[PDB]
Design a binder for this molecule. Structure first.
Ligand SMILES: Nc1ncnc2c1ncn2[C@@H]1O[C@H](CSCC[C@H](N)C(=O)O)[C@@H](O)[C@H]1O
Length: 220
């Protein structure tokens, strides 16, 4: 069910050959490991969860890849160096305040070579629970509650549960600018004609009219 998401992130990333890559909020390492498979020179993954990093390391042992993992809170992260690429699939929606969203963007900037780039996948600020739930596409959004200047959502995968935050487009763009990224662009998920042809008609209507997801590319 992650086909669109994978396609969009690797579209944003482009050619990884010979690059150094920091995969933030890496989970068991899905994106970092695939980025290595596609030719990256070196991949480091970071996650706040000790359990997730324990699985990430077990996965790297099982296929013998050279990924290195760290247990760190990205918002409050010990410096790890500078990379050609920072990948952040489902990092920023875990920032629990606008202040912590802004700190995460500053950490990413400090982690980038001058010619590097951030590729991110996060919650679309324009998502509105009343316009259509996302359960049909893999994420059952259970509720939507005002949380300071943003919104908090409880959700679950179709049944592992989790909670995340939907900050406004203006707050994301201020965090980006104030962290020192001189260029950014929002990327619509890459729903393609083949996806439409292989699903019942109108299956993707809510995905198009009320997408939970968005891509984001930022450059110093
Ligand atoms: N402050 C923080 N710093 C680092 N990781 C965090 C974090 N808050 C949440 N996470 C991690 O973010 C992950 C979101 S799930 C995304 C996992 C992976 N990038 C993938 O797409 O497959 C979880 O594994 C969670 O432990």
């Amino acid at each position: 069910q992650r086909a669109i998401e994978v396609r969009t992130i690797f579209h944003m990333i482009g050619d990884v050959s010979g690059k150094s890559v920091l995969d933030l909020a890496c989970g068991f390492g899905f994106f970092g490991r695939e980025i290595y498979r596609r030719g990256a020179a070196k991949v480091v993954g970071v996650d706040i969860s000790e359990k997730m990093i324990e699985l990430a390391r077990e996965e790297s042992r099982k296929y013998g890849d050279p990924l290195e993992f760290h247990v760190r809170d990205v918002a409050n992260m010990e410096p790890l160096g500078q990379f050609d690429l920072v990948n952040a699939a489902w990092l920023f929606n875990y920032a629990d305040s606008v202040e912590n969203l802004r700190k995460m963007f500053k950490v990413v900037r400090a982690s980038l070579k001058p010619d590097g780039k951030l590729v991110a996948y996060t919650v679309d600020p324009d998502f509105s629970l009343a316009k259509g739930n996302f359960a049909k596409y893999g994420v059952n959004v259970l509720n939507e509650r005002a949380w300071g200047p943003g919104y908090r959502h409880d959700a679950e995968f179709v049944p592992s549960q989790f909670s995340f935050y939907r900050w406004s487009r203006a707050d994301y763009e201020s965090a980006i600018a104030d962290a020192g990224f001189s260029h950014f662009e929002w990327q619509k998920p890459l729903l393609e004609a083949d996806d439409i042809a292989t699903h019942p008609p109108g299956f993707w209507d809510v995905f198009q009219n009320n997408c939970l997801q968005t891509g984001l590319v930022c450059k110093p």
